[PDB]
């Protein structure tokens, strides 16, 4: 029976108690076959890390802090998930294995208000992108989400993550505005003018008066969010998916050095701008053994095969241009000469192609007009049960890194016994370079190679000057220690805040690498 | 001889030898006459509330650290400026009354990097809009600044009280990425990327990983910030900026409908709009004895001989365009379309208005492309010894909601004998009205008058849903004392990671209303 660190059978049994007395007996879940379901579906190391001892599912904010409270009573350590579809970093897997999983999604599922005139909406955990497209569609349709690659995630958890998608609303955190925040001994607070009794106000300005808190509620063990209000974009009055496909791998220099200047004024490049190898376009549509069937990577055949079969590239950039078809036909026009100046450069439209080849473009298409999607979920079915671990650093939108970290990664790739599946994304004045790490789950091996890689990408990733943005509860403690500036001045300062708002250091424990002190230095 | 409060003649002595010992004899400064430089230009109630007991200015980040240092082994309260030109605000006064001022804008005043492609500065404190201005002109000509009214304030400063200026790049603190902080027990931290050792992409995204802290900063005294970097827009390839005159003061609730589907896309509502009051026009270019000599308030009247003379409405509109001419030209056309269904507006270009009346708009001209002035300080000789208290609150971008606050702020300042000055500002869902109450500084009556004035004015503000976003020293208690949902939930947190960061109690006391627990509830 999964008891939590440093809880006793005894109090293990009375804080179930005192949880079932709160939120029901059915909202207190600790049957095997119930915690299974919480399993990371993608684990890494041992596929027995990151268990469960409970799942707790409150239905309100009171729940929220009567559970904090019983928690700090009997020291119950307790994870965070609103929809916990945290799939490439742990699911809905603690960090802390035989945490208590707080489950907010399930009973606080409400959208609590949409404006459609000042374009916000506030929300419970619960509500997933497609919740809240299907909300906007039958009552503020003069309004758009921006969603991720998947639709089943939560608005606020993927926020809470700092997640992103691909409309100009891209940077989800940006877009925050305004929380309802359960601090670690059970105190509830209201982030920016939601501290004003009675304000307009909460969503339609980040800020309030005085210090700035949200950002310390994301990537974080500091609270536990029941409300988050969000700004929601216009529907612009027309729109249009571009897919140029670009023959040879060594075009990434020339790309990225072309992007920039066009996204970084959020114009032409309107939306968020995604540039994808071969792999990851044609791993949607195909499985591995459909190209290669012998050992060892891919071989360049292989590759031409795909890129042939198909009618892609190496390198294959999709966006979404927005506005009357005037502007449209104009941006397009800067869009095509510009990376027309690279010979093999092919351009089709979301209207010109419809065949196995443009199934990205279209799915791209919903994507960035936030309409939510589960195509993507096809990538899972490459090789037999496949799962992502996620490596995504930061880089200059410079093509000399993109071809520095292109190689890097994928020579370690090919050692690694993992295909290299990647994409370069430009938010405004940074790149990150996406890496899916596909690897059969079912396999100690290659969950064990898959570990093994990804820690020695982010070593060799960090001392090139690039830093993980996001990372698996198996990388955590890592990726902490890799933004170690001043003798680990900035986890001295997390732990200093975390002791002092969390002094019984109950929630999520090892979040982002901050270990609150009765867990710290434990090796977990 | 002005002593810190809770410190001995004793330990003030040593401190101030440490001090010296670390920054210089020169730059230890005790001289009444040098310390009067310190005093807020523009006091409301006692002129001699908030007085500096001496002033350091440390050569950078190391001596920084040392001077913090010494403060927390003596207790000498430590209040910060970069320029300290936080006038309207207590200048470089400190809030706690005998706090020694760390001058860091003095010394630390280098622009640290530029980078044109990629658009960015790091930056010391010292820094003016003057000064990167001349810079970007001379060495990095594609980028513009985003400055507020006045050139001689501090790019970091500003920033740091999340003041504001009116291109696209408006919100200072949105574009602030990566700071170097020393913390308050004399720990040096960088956030973001920074805080990666080698990382090429501190001023490229401001997160990092982890919690994001760089807003605990802003209106702030958790720490004194050495470093900062901010995100450079490329000036467009042209721009135009216009007036709208609109005649009625009931036109506002109008204006402000029409304005808000305009600039809630940024565009055509390209930069920030502002909706500035005959008084607040008229005071840049005249005096008040030039339309009234009688007492009372201004009558009617006087308000329609501004209006002719000048050539100005009761709401003067500024906006600039951008882009090639042929964008300008339709984004215009669209402009003019949507207000001229207001009776009475009428449009002048910046090339088609150079009189008296068009003095505003010439300076709104350089201010939103990012060419520094200090046009805005003829506003202080509207009256002898003028001087301004600011008053800001945020509100819905609705008419009937600016209505009701022009109503209700006249009103009171009728009746408090001073003049109003106002202007409405939307960023871009959020509405500011910024009032500038103008005083004589030099008449103790005139001081209470505009003290007593504005604590009306923030509390029927706040029950009407209305939060202040920035206040002076004075107000500073009274403001934080308005966000107060749930008991007290917000002030409580800031105070539990004040005494966790600060437990000698020595940065800023009583910055925003946070008090360290040993200057908290002793009325100063
Ligand atoms: C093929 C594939 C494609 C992907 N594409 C994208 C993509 O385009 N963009 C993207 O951003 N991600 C992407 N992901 C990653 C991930 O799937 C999504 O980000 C997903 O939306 C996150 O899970 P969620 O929304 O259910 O959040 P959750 O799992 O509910 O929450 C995420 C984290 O937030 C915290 N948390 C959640 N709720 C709270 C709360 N109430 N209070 C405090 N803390 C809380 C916890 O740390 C938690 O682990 C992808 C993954 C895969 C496998
Ligand atoms: C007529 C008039 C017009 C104005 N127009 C505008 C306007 O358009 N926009 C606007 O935003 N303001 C405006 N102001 C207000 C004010 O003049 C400006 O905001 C000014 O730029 C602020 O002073 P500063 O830049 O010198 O900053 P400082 O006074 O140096 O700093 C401001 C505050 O930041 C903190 N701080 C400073 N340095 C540090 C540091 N190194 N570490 C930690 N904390 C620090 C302190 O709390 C300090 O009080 C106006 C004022 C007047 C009188
Ligand atoms: C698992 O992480 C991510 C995956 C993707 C798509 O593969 C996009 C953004 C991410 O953060
Ligand atoms: C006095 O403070 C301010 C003044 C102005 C312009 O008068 C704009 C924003 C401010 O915060």
Not at 237 to 266: C, W
Not at 318 to 325: A, C, D, E, S
């Amino acid at each position: 029976r999964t008891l939590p660190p440093g809880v006793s059978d005894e109090d293990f049994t009375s804080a179930l108690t005192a949880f079932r007395d709160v939120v029901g007996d059915e909202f207190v879940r600790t049957d095997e076959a119930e915690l299974a379901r919480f399993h990371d579906p993608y684990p890494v190391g041992d596929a027995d890390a990151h268990l469960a001892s409970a799942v707790i599912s409150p239905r309100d904010t009171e729940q929220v802090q009567e559970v904090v409270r019983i928690a700090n009573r009997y020291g119950i350590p307790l994870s965070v998930i609103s929809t916990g579809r945290n799939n490439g970093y742990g699911g809905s897997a603690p960090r802390l294995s035989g945490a208590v999983v707080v489950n907010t999604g399930e009973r606080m599922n409400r959208i609590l208000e949409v404006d459609e005139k000042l374009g916000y909406a506030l929300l419970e955990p619960g509500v997933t992108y497609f919740d809240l497209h299907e909300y906007l569609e039958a009552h503020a349709p003069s309004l758009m989400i921006d969603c991720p690659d998947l639709g089943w995630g939560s608005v606020v958890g993927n926020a809470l993550d700092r997640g992103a998608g691909y409309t100009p609303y891209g940077d989800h955190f940006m877009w925050q505005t305004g929380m309802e925040v359960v601090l670690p001994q059970g105190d509830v607070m209201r982030t920016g003018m939601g501290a004003l009794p009675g304000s307009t106000t909460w969503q339609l300005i980040p800020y309030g008066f005085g210090p700035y808190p949200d950002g310390m509620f994301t990537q974080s063990n500091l609270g536990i969010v029941t409300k988050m209000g969000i700004a929601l974009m216009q529907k612009p009055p027309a729109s249009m998916t571009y897919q140029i496909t670009f023959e040879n791998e060594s075009d990434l220099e020339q790309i990225v050095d072309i992007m920039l200047p066009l996204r970084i004024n959020m114009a032409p490049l309107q939306n968020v701008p995604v540039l994808r190898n071969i792999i990851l376009d044609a791993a949607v549509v195909s499985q591995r053994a459909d190209w290669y069937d012998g050992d060892g990577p891919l071989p360049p055949e292989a590759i031409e095969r795909m890129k042939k079969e198909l009618g892609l590239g190496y390198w294959n950039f999709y966006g979404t241009l927005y506005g009357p078809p005037q502007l449209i036909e104009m941006n397009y026009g800067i869009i095509k000469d510009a990376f027309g100046q690279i010979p093999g450069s092919r351009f089709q439209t979301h209207e010109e192609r419809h065949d196995r080849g443009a199934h990205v473009l279209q799915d791209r298409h919903k994507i960035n007009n936030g309409i939510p999607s589960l195509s993507e979920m096809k990538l899972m079915d490459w090789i037999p049960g496949a799962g992502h671990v996620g490596f995504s650093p930061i880089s200059p939108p410079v093509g000399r890194d993109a071809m520095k970290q292109f190689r890097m990664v994928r020579s370690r790739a090919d050692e690694y016994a993992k295909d290299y599946a990647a994409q370069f994304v430009v938010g405004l004045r940074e790149m990150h370079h996406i890496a899916l790490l596909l690897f059969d789950t079912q396999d100690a091996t290659a969950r064990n190679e898959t570990l093994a890689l990804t820690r020695l990408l982010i070593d060799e990733a960090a001392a090139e000057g690039y830093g993980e943005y996001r990372t698996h509860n198996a990388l955590m403690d890592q990726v902490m220690g890799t933004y170690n500036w001043g003798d680990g001045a900035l986890l001295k300062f997390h732990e200093a805040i975390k002791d002092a708002l969390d002094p019984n250091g109950i929630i999520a424990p090892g979040k982002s690498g901050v270990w609150p002190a009765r867990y710290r230095g434990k090796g977990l």
